[PDB]
Ligand SMILES: COc1ccc(-c2nc([C@@H](C)Sc3nc(N)cc(N)n3)c(C)s2)cc1OCCF
Ligand SMILES: COc1ccc(-c2nc([C@@H](C)Sc3nc(N)cc(N)n3)c(C)s2)cc1OCCF
Ligand SMILES: COc1ccc(-c2nc([C@H](C)Sc3nc(N)cc(N)n3)c(C)s2)cc1OCCF
Ligand SMILES: COc1ccc(-c2nc([C@H](C)Sc3nc(N)cc(N)n3)c(C)s2)cc1OCCF
Ligand SMILES: O=c1ccn([C@@H]2O[C@H](COP(=O)(O)OP(=O)(O)O)[C@@H](O)[C@H]2O)c(=O)[nH]1
């Protein structure tokens with residue numbers, strides 16, 4: 001009865017900015033930052049999170065499997081914690097996930113494989129480890145909906161340029177372009193098949209977020225509220 | 232209501248030999264062979280397994296973390312599948328598991344960390360997951376007892392010969408010696424402080440298997456029967 005909705009989009013699309021706006025508008029609405037975002041900048045996980053982040057950057061062909069598995073594991077734990085810990089005293093509870101286990105596999109992991117940073121065996125083991133590990137533990141992480149925050153690679157690039165973090169100034173447009181295409185095919189075009197038949201029919205809301213919405217988001221929030229009523 | 236017993240033992244101590252003997256003595260007795268034993272002679276799991284096993288051997292400092300995670304995932308599934316699909320119509324059901332998720336971590340994975348085949352981050356990540364894979368999936372697999380087929384490292388090396396796998400003739404005594412000590416600390420002196428609380432009080436039966444037993448196994452089985460009557 002808690003509604004689970006994932007916020008999808010490219011790097012620097014505005015997902016953190018969006019969910020940080022959404023969380024303050026209602027008591028019935030909670031948020032789960034993706035752990036990779038927390039790793040980027042201390043617990044057992046945060047330490048391993050930092051190290052593997054750096055290792056991955058320094059050698060993706062060595063670390064893409066290690067990182068993807070841990071990133072997904074951590075997300076499932078961060079999400080299950082929120083399902084069981086939050087929104088019991090809410091009449092219309094909504095839980096907004098920053099990305100999803102589907103993003104983990106069908107965007108990031110899938111891209112690393114296609115970039116040759118995972119070999120066939122690693123990608124094959126990862127999919128098995130994902131197919132199985134979600135279809136019980138994170139069985140009822142099933143999402144009620146997806147909000148797709150669509151921004152072009154250039155916007156995202158400028159929002160990386162604008163965010164100003166030293167470590168990401170070097171992310172190349174080509175990669176952003178690569179991630180954009182994977183999102184479009186899953187979320188906009190719907191060609192990409194998955195091993196999770198319900199996702200073929202789960203309702204998506206696309207929002208166009210090229211235009212800065214920081215001072216001006218009501219049309220966007222109006223669209224979210226309207227989307228929630230159809231679920 | 233199925234009693235769960237792990238048979239634990241160094242490389243070629245005689246575990247396969249034993250379990251297969253035990254499987255024949257009662258329609259109530261069934262065995263779960265270990266994933267890696269399967270791989271060491273097809274399904275996505277077999278292919279993935281054969282590949283990861285070969286790369287492990289070639290370059291353990293690259294493939295230990297991956298191998299270990301897939302080994303343990305695989306074991307967890309098998310021991311689930313065996314609880315579901317075996318000994319349904321048994322009065323006194325007993326499942327003998329060939330090794331356990333505990334030898335996975337505290338013998339093998341630990342040894343590979345100790346021999347610098349996993350770094351700290353790999354090892355803490357492994358331990359982080361292991362803790363959770365079991366908690367989320369592996370609850371029903373908790374052990375009623377352990378049987379330690381205890382043999383000298385010299386015995387096992389000799390036994391590798393008798394088994395005649397060309398591949399295996401390269402296994403050094405110093406490796407067996409490290410695995411042996413870890414078996415002793417864990418299962419004899421009961422020094423190893425596992426994170427899993429119920430293990431401190433799990434019954435252990437320790438069987439000197441240094442003599443050949445293939446055609447002279449009655450007395451070992453008698454101890455198993457006594458042990459099993461105490462659980
Ligand atoms: C020098 O090359 C690289 C440097 C860094 C990367 C990284 N990609 C990423 C993410 C986009 S992968 C990711 N992010 C998430 N947020 C979640 C998830 N499961 N996976 C990093 C955090 S670092 C990827 C790199 O290479 C791609 C080669 F094609
Ligand atoms: C050149 O160095 C190595 C060569 C081979 C190994 C291997 N260990 C193993 C297993 C004993 S590790 C294992 N076996 C199992 N049966 C189960 C499990 N969870 N882990 C191999 C199949 S290959 C390990 C090696 O490094 C040992 C470092 F401690
Ligand atoms: C093909 O080359 C690349 C592909 C992707 C990247 C990415 N880097 C990043 C970050 C810089 S990794 C990161 N971000 C942080 N904020 C902090 C930190 N320690 N590590 C992504 C999120 S994607 C970086 C790439 O290299 C460009 C500079 F080497
Ligand atoms: C420190 O050096 C070693 C440590 C461990 C080994 C091991 N090899 C093996 C087997 C030969 S791996 C194996 N066994 C099989 N039966 C089949 C197969 N494909 N791979 C172990 C079970 S342990 C071998 C080692 O040295 C090999 C010398 F090259
Ligand atoms: O409408 C927007 C959305 C985002 N940003 C900024 O652009 C950067 C990227 O946004 P965010 O970090 O939320 O993106 P994410 O990577 O979480 O998608 C941030 O520094 C934001 O403050 C902005 O100025 N206007």
Ligand SMILES: O=c1ccn([C@@H]2O[C@H](COP(=O)(O)OP(=O)(O)O)[C@@H](O)[C@H]2O)c(=O)[nH]1
Pocket residue numbers: 240241242243244245246247248249390391393394395442443444445
């Ligand atoms: O009592 C025994 C136990 C084992 N073996 C031999 O030792 C080798 C290793 O046996 P097993 O496969 O049971 O070892 P494990 O399963 O412990 O690796 C095989 O050739 C067995 O035939 C034997 O001759 N007598």
